[PDB]
Amino acid sequence: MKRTFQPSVLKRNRSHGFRARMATKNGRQVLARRRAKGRARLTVS
Amino acid sequence: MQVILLDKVANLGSLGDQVNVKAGYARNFLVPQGKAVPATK
Amino acid sequence: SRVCQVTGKRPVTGNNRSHALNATKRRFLPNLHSHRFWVESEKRFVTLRVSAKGMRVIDKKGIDTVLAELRARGEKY
Amino acid sequence: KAXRAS
RNA sequence: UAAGGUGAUAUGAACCGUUAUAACCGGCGAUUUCCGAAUGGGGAAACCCAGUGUGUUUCGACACACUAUCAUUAACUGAAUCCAUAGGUUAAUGAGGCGAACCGGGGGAACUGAAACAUCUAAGUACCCCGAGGAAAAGAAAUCAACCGAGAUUCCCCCAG
RNA sequence: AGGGUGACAGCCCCGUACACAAAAAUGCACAUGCUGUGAGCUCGAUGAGUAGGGCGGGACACGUGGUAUCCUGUCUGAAUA
RNA sequence: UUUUGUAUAAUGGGUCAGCGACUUAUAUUCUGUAGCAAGGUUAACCGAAUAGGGGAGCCGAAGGGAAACCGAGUCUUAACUGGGCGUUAAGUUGCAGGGUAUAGACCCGAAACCCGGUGAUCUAGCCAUGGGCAGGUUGAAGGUUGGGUAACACUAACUGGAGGACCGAACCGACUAAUGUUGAAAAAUUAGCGGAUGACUUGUGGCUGGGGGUGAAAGGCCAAUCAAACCGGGAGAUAGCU
RNA sequence: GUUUAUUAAAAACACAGCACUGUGCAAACACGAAAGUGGACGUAUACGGUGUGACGCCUGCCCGGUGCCGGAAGGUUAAUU
RNA sequence: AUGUUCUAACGUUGACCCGUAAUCCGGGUUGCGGACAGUGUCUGGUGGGUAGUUUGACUGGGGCGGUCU
Ligand SMILES: [K+]
Ligand SMILES: [K+]
Ligand SMILES: [K+]
Ligand SMILES: [K+]
Ligand SMILES: [K+]
Ligand SMILES: [K+]
Ligand SMILES: [K+]
Ligand SMILES: [K+]
Ligand SMILES: [K+]
Ligand SMILES: [K+]
Ligand SMILES: [K+]
Ligand SMILES: [K+]
Ligand SMILES: [K+]
Ligand SMILES: [K+]
Ligand SMILES: [K+]
Ligand SMILES: [K+]
Ligand SMILES: [K+]
Ligand SMILES: [K+]
Ligand SMILES: [K+]
Ligand SMILES: [K+]
Ligand SMILES: [Mg+2]
Ligand SMILES: [Mg+2]
Ligand SMILES: [Mg+2]
Ligand SMILES: [Mg+2]
Ligand SMILES: [Mg+2]
Ligand SMILES: [Mg+2]
Ligand SMILES: [Mg+2]
Ligand SMILES: [Mg+2]
Ligand SMILES: [Mg+2]
Ligand SMILES: [Mg+2]
Ligand SMILES: [Mg+2]
Ligand SMILES: [Mg+2]
Ligand SMILES: [Mg+2]
Ligand SMILES: [Mg+2]
Ligand SMILES: [Mg+2]
Ligand SMILES: [Mg+2]
Ligand SMILES: [Mg+2]
Ligand SMILES: [Mg+2]
Ligand SMILES: [Mg+2]
Ligand SMILES: [Mg+2]
Ligand SMILES: [Mg+2]
Ligand SMILES: [Mg+2]
Ligand SMILES: [Mg+2]
Ligand SMILES: [Mg+2]
Ligand SMILES: [Mg+2]
Ligand SMILES: [Mg+2]
Ligand SMILES: [Mg+2]
Ligand SMILES: [Mg+2]
Ligand SMILES: [Mg+2]
Ligand SMILES: [Mg+2]
Ligand SMILES: [Mg+2]
Ligand SMILES: [Mg+2]
Ligand SMILES: [Mg+2]
Ligand SMILES: [Mg+2]
Ligand SMILES: [Mg+2]
Ligand SMILES: [Mg+2]
Ligand SMILES: [Mg+2]
Ligand SMILES: [Mg+2]
Ligand SMILES: [Mg+2]
Ligand SMILES: [Mg+2]
C-alpha cells in the first residue's frame, strides 16, 4: 500500500529548506526558535 | 471660501471685489484659472 | 494605505454597539479622496490622497505651506 | 491586459 | 610568568625548553575559507554563473579590487514638452540582520466567572506587529485645592476594598 | 573564609587577612587647549482647521447615567490676554 | 472504593522499589499564647545596622439617625404612657492554630473554545510538461463504380475505419467468498470480478490552507488524524462529575 | 462514468437533454479590508445560478400563505433639522 | 425642491504620446461620462451568509400528558 512519505529531495528542499524558511518572516521565526532551542539541524537542508 | 477676484467673473463681481464662493468653485475653477485669489494677505 | 497625506488621519478601531450593547470590533476610515491640487508656484497639478478635513486644511493654509510640511516629513508627491 | 503576448 | 612543555578522550611517537623568543597567562596586532543580513547575478544555505577596472603571463592562463537594495545630499544628465519637471547615471554618508527580559506604540482573543447567558467578566490579559534605549515612558500646570494653600514627572507606603 | 592532600589539618599544599604590581589597551572623575555651542540685558511676541460644538466610538474606577474631564473617525468651528 | 446494603459475579490493584494529593501569599474573623494597656501598633523609608529612628496611618476608648444633626443618649412622632438601637462588658500588636476571602487553592482527568504558526511528499480538484494502453472483434459517416431520377431521392457492390463500441493481458479498479483478525499486512492474500482509446491511466513539477481548501456530493478527502487538520501557546480552561 | 482510502458501488452522484432565472460587459457571479484576479483574451447561439435528468407520450387545477417581480397615489417611518 | 444645459472636481477596464528595452504604473494629450457615479461618516431596511447562545423542573426511567403560587 502507498504510504504517506514519498521522498523527493527537490520537494523536501523547496517545502522546508533553508531558503524556503528565509523567504518569509514566519519561516525566519522558525529558524529563530530552532536556534534559540539550540538545534543541531536548523532545517532539512 | 471668501476670495478676491483678479478679473471680472460672470455673476460674481468685477476686479478687486471680494466674494464668498462655494469652496469647490474656488478650489477647482476660479483659483487654477487665475480668476480669483484666496483672501489671504 | 488609507492615510491622509496632509493630516495623517488613518483607520482607527472601535466598536459597533447594538441596542443590547453587544460590542463588535469595527474600523472608522478617513474620508479619503485623491485630488489634483493646483500649485501655482510650480505651475503644476499635484495629486494628493487627502481626507476631506485635509482639503479644508489646504484651503486654510494654502497648498504651498502644506506641501512644504510634506517635504519636511519626507512624505512624497 | 496579460501573460499570454499581453 | 616560568622549569617545565607540544588542549581532551589518550597513550605513544617525534620533538621543544630549563635564566630566558619552551609552554602557559594578559594587552595590542596579523591571518581570518565557505554559508548566513549576505550585498555582483542566481540558488535546492554552505553551491552555480558573471561584468568591469587595474596589474601580471610561459597566450594555456594568473592575481587583485570593485559591482545589492533603499534613504539622504551632491554633481552631471535628461521625456512627453517650449521652459521645466519626471526619469537616468555617478559620488559621498547612513540603513539593513541578530538578541532573554524590561519599555513605548499599532492591532487584539477565547476559555473562564456570572453557579445557564447576551450587558458585564476574563482583559487591554494571551498573542501578532512596529519602534527604541540602557533603561524607556513621563515631565516643568490651560495641575490640584478650597477662599487656606500647594507647586514638573516618576516610584514606594497610606488614604481604602 | 574555602578547597586539596591515603580518615577529620590554623601551622603539608593551594589559598585566606594583609601589603604590593602594568609595557599596552580601555571605563570613569577631574584639570587644561582646540573646534563648533552661544550667556546677558532692553524691546517684544505668546502655538487655529485649534478650543468648543453635532453625530459615532473609545478612554477615564465611572457600563450614558443627572455625567463633568480626555482622545478622535465624521461634519463643523471661536475668542486669541 | 462506593453504597440502604458488597465474599460479592460492582470498582481498582500482576508484584516490588522509588515518586505521587489540603500548599503558598495576602486579607479577614475566632481561639490559644506573649507584650503593652485606655491605649495598642507602626508602613514605606532612613539606618552597614533583626538595633535605633520613622506614629503617615490603622484599630480601640460612643452611640443613635438615611442625613443634617444631636450625643450617654439618639431615632421615631405634633408628642410619647412609649418603642428600636445604644449607655451599666478592654483594647491592641505580635506569634501559633481553626475557618473564610482572592488567587490553579487537595491531586489527577474532559469533550471543547480562542490565538499564532506548520502541512497538498497521503489524498481531493486543477495547472504545465512527459509516458502507457499485448492481442483479437464489430464495421458508423464518408468515398468510388454500377443501378435508378427531369434532377434529387433511393438502391447494390467495393472501399472506408467511427465509437465515453465489443472480447481480452499490461495498466486502473474493488462485486462475491474463504483465509487472516496478538495478521505475512494498522485493510492484505487466494479464487473468481469490473473498466481497459477514455468523463482513461501514469511520471515529474506546480497551485489551492483550516470555518479554510478541494469534493461527478460519501460530511468524502486535506500525511495511518476530520461535523472543523496538525503543532505551539492562552493553559493548571472549566469539571455542582468519577 | 462517479462515490463513503479502511464494513455501504447502489436505486445514491454525474450525465447528454430539458426548463426557469440572472447577466449589456468595468456582465452577473466568485476570491479578495484593497489593489487586483477568475468569469474571458469570452460578449446573450455567451456566461452564472437553480431544479429536472436519454428518448417517447406528456406535464392538469390553485397566486390565499411564503418568496420573487412590477407599481407607488395614499398610510406609517431613520439620521437630519 | 425639481428640470435642463455646462465644465473645472471626479470616473474612464476608449484612443494616442512619453518615461520605456515594460503591456503594470505614472505623467501628458484627446474623446466619452460628469457633479452623476463612487468612497467616508451617520442613518432606516434587509441579512442563518456568518457568529455567540438559549431552548425549566417535577416525573415509580425519559418522553407525551398533567403539574408549578
Ligand atoms: K464570553
Ligand atoms: K457555572
Ligand atoms: K585544610
Ligand atoms: K473638532
Ligand atoms: K451503586
Ligand atoms: K462491571
Ligand atoms: K487566621
Ligand atoms: K491574640
Ligand atoms: K429610648
Ligand atoms: K492581650
Ligand atoms: K480548577
Ligand atoms: K485553600
Ligand atoms: K478549523
Ligand atoms: K458497482
Ligand atoms: K403570491
Ligand atoms: K479625461
Ligand atoms: K455623487
Ligand atoms: K442571518
Ligand atoms: K414516583
Ligand atoms: K418503575
Ligand atoms: Mg542574493
Ligand atoms: Mg553573492
Ligand atoms: Mg535596527
Ligand atoms: Mg457561566
Ligand atoms: Mg526619555
Ligand atoms: Mg492664592
Ligand atoms: Mg575511607
Ligand atoms: Mg499658549
Ligand atoms: Mg477642554
Ligand atoms: Mg473636539
Ligand atoms: Mg461636551
Ligand atoms: Mg464613549
Ligand atoms: Mg445499588
Ligand atoms: Mg456479607
Ligand atoms: Mg452478587
Ligand atoms: Mg470484585
Ligand atoms: Mg470469583
Ligand atoms: Mg465506577
Ligand atoms: Mg483490574
Ligand atoms: Mg458615631
Ligand atoms: Mg469500451
Ligand atoms: Mg476508488
Ligand atoms: Mg484478485
Ligand atoms: Mg462492459
Ligand atoms: Mg474488457
Ligand atoms: Mg448523511
Ligand atoms: Mg487520513
Ligand atoms: Mg469548532
Ligand atoms: Mg486563562
Ligand atoms: Mg486541567
Ligand atoms: Mg458502470
Ligand atoms: Mg468503504
Ligand atoms: Mg465495498
Ligand atoms: Mg475583468
Ligand atoms: Mg433527480
Ligand atoms: Mg405542475
Ligand atoms: Mg447558529
Ligand atoms: Mg462562551
Ligand atoms: Mg449550549
Ligand atoms: Mg427532568
Swiss-Prot record, chain A:
It holds the Pfam family Ribosomal_L34. GO terms for molecular function: structural constituent of ribosome. One of its GO terms (cellular component) is cytoplasm. The keyword Ribosomal protein applies. GO terms for biological process: cytoplasmic translation. The keyword NAD does not apply. Keywords: Ribonucleoprotein, Ribosomal protein. Part of the 50S ribosomal subunit. Belongs to the bacterial ribosomal protein bL34 family. This is Large ribosomal subunit protein bL34. It comes from Escherichia coli (strain K12).
UniProtKB/Swiss-Prot annotation, chain B:
Belongs to the bacterial ribosomal protein bL9 family. One of the primary rRNA binding proteins, it binds very close to the 3' end of the 23S rRNA. Part of the 50S ribosomal subunit. In stalled/collided disomes (pairs of ribosomes where the leading ribosome is stalled and a second ribosome has collided with it) bL9 in the collided ribosome contacts bS6 and uL2, while it contacts only helices of the 16S rRNA in the stalled ribosome; the inter-ribosome bridge thus formed is different from that formed between normally translating ribosomes. This is Large ribosomal subunit protein bL9. The chain holds residues 1 to 41 of 149 of the full protein.
Curated annotation (Swiss-Prot), chain C:
Pfam families: Ribosomal_L28. Coiled coil: none annotated. Transmembrane segments: none annotated. One of its GO terms (cellular component) is cytoplasm. GO terms for biological process: cytoplasmic translation; ribosomal large subunit assembly. Signal peptide: none annotated. One of its GO terms (molecular function) is structural constituent of ribosome. Keywords: Ribonucleoprotein, Ribosomal protein, RNA-binding, rRNA-binding. InterPro entries: Ribosomal_bL28, Ribosomal_bL28/bL31-like_sf, Ribosomal_bL28_bact-type, Ribosomal_bL28_sf. The keyword rRNA-binding applies. Belongs to the bacterial ribosomal protein bL28 family. Part of the 50S ribosomal subunit. This is Large ribosomal subunit protein bL28. It comes from Escherichia coli (strain K12).
